[PDB]
Amino acid sequence: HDYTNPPWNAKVPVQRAMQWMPISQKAGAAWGVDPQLITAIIAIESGGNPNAVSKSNAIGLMQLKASTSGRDVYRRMGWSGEPTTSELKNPERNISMGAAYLNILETGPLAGIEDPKVLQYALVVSYANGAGALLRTFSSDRKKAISKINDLDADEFLEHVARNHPAPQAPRYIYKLEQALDAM
């Protein structure tokens, strides 16, 4: 299946995502996450609409599900429970939480990925469809998965995701990421 069709035109989504850049820069510097990756994710997830709600109830600029990333980010803060839908519609909270989740993905399940480009692809695919789902396409054992990921360059990683990831959305996300980065 051609994960690049239909083509995704990044101009409008990215330009709108850029209007949130003051928040993304601050969030990014706080969590050690690249503001451009944050901007691309905004463009891709919501096209810059802070009230966006997906069919699976992902919410806001960076489309967080309260029950997954919301819960995990709260945990990382030392809090119980999860944010509300309403709370996820607040731009600052949404972006700061998205940035925190990216940090959680990089420092936890994706720790050990050597090539920064491969890591970037792995992050967006984990963000969109879950780290476990990504890692299990390489191995049931996390260290082995990371090891296998480290054997690939960024283009080979994309190819593996396109061939082996059960979610069709996963490789398309990488395609959109590159479209988005260029519109910046």
Ligand X SMILES: CC(=O)N[C@@H]1[C@@H](O[C@H](C)C(=O)O)[C@H](O[C@@H]2O[C@H](CO)[C@@H](O)[C@H](O)[C@H]2NC(C)=O)[C@@H](CO)O[C@H]1O
- Shortest approach of ligand X to residue 134 CB, angstroms? 15
Should residue 101 be labelled a site residue for ligand BLG when binding is judged by CB under 6 A? yes
Interaction between residue 27 and ligand BLG (CB under 6 A): no
User: Considering CB distances under 5 to 8 angstroms, the limit depending on partner class, which of ligand X, ligand BLG, none binds residue 52?
Assistant: ligand X
# binding residues, ligand BLG (CB under 6 A) = 16
Q: Which of 69, 96, 120, 179 binds ligand BLG (CB under 6 A)?
A: 69
Which one of ligand X, ligand BLG, none is in contact with 15 (Cβ closer than 5 to 8 A by kind)?
Answer: none
> What is the smallest separation between the CB atom of 65 and ligand BLG, expressed in angstroms?
4
Task: Please state, in angstroms and rounded to a whole number, the distance separating the CA atoms of residues 54 and 7.
Answer: 20
Residue 133: count of CB within 10 angstroms of its CB? 15
**Encoding tokens for residue 17?**
């995502």
* 120 belongs to the binding site for ligand BLG (CB under 6 A): no
- Continuous segment of H or E residues that includes residue 172: helix 169-182
Sequence-distant contacts of 153-159: CB under 8 A, at least 24 apart: 153/115, 153/117, 153/118, 154/115, 154/117, 154/118, 154/120, 154/121, 157/118, 157/121, 157/122, 158/121
| 45 binds ligand X, rule: CB under 6 A | yes
Would you give the DSSP letter of residue 50?
T
Interacting residues with ligand BLG (CB under 6 A): 45, 54-56, 58, 63-65, 68-69, 101, 127-130, 132
